[PDB]
Amino acid sequence: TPSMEDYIEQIYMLIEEKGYARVSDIAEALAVHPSSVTKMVQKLDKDEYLIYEKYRGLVLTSKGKKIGKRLVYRHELLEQFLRIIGVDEEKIYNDVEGIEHHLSWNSIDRIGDLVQYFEEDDARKKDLKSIQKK
Template sequence: MLTPSMEDYLETIYELMKEKGYARVSDIATILAVQPSSVTKMIQKLDEKNFVTYEKYRGLVLTPEGEQLGRNMKQRHRMLEDFLRLLGVGESTIRKDVEGIEHHISPSTMRSLQSLVLFFQEYPEYQRAFERFRRLQAGTAEDRSTENLKVMDE
């Protein structure tokens, strides 16, 4: 089992490897907004689990299993962003919600969500119908439940 924190690290290391070809402790620390010492500790744990390893000259690299997991994390993150975007959620809320939600999505839930995203992409007329429906809903909901939502927005 991976912890949410391990998932974030694997995703970040995977992204850095793809972008730059290497993943430095300082870059990981900046992206995840943690201390370099925390990064070092987590890398040790990921090393024990055989998800990362150190190679002479190249430095930190993902093992094949680590790379597979990192790719999965990245795909899941992107898919959730696409899904919330499709629902009309704003970008800053998407960023915040996805960082939390992604760690609690089972593979089977992910497959179903992915299908829904593809479904709307394949049938844009259904997506437009939903879009109209959502705007109408938002209009009528505003009058009656602004109070409820204020409490939750706090």
Template sequence: MEDYLEKIYELIHEKGYARVSDIANSLAVQPSSVTKMLQKLDENEYVSYEKYRGIVLTARGHKMGRLMKERHAMLADFLRMLGVQEDTLQKDVEGIEHHVSPATLEALQSLVLFLQAHPDVLTSFLSFREQSSERSST
């Protein structure tokens, strides 16, 4: 559900609307799967969905979609800070965001904010990491 809410939120902010076909293409799923999930999201009051009409995020859905988007961005920022390559980064973010507790996500957010406020610490870490990798490759 979270992936769908994040994608709907993203599409509405990018294009002004979200269609079943857009969601299906973005998430690489069948339109029938999107329709089923939209019905569940509607039942749980995250979206207002009527077949052959638009998809509208409820206030609850908008809040959850925004939180999913922010969580995704924070995790991507964190992995970028650590020097993880972009092709690996997106796959890892998808895995992490669904298997980590809210408390751990909060701790990671604090760490990201700390590293942004103290770039010297991040520079020291990256230097340490590079030296460690050089030592292990010899």
């Protein structure tokens, strides 16, 4: 059962490089009853995540765009993170997948400050690799 968050992420991609999002497209990528999209897209509208453009179809409001873009950011940030601390590229996605839906934006924020702490220079992120060689 995809989350209101999964939709917005999904509805985001289906809009990003697929014009706009049609209720059938959702019940596709998310792989769930096409009536579960209308049931949900109903609450998404109520939550100001998207409005329905007569004739054109569903589109995200600045809010939805915001929430959606932030989700995308969370995924890449977590991957950058796992990778920057030196984790088997193979694992990166695996772990990020498992954890991403279980972390507060507070952690996602401090993890950014963490990724920051390093990325700014290849040296400081070396000492990390030096400790890893044990």
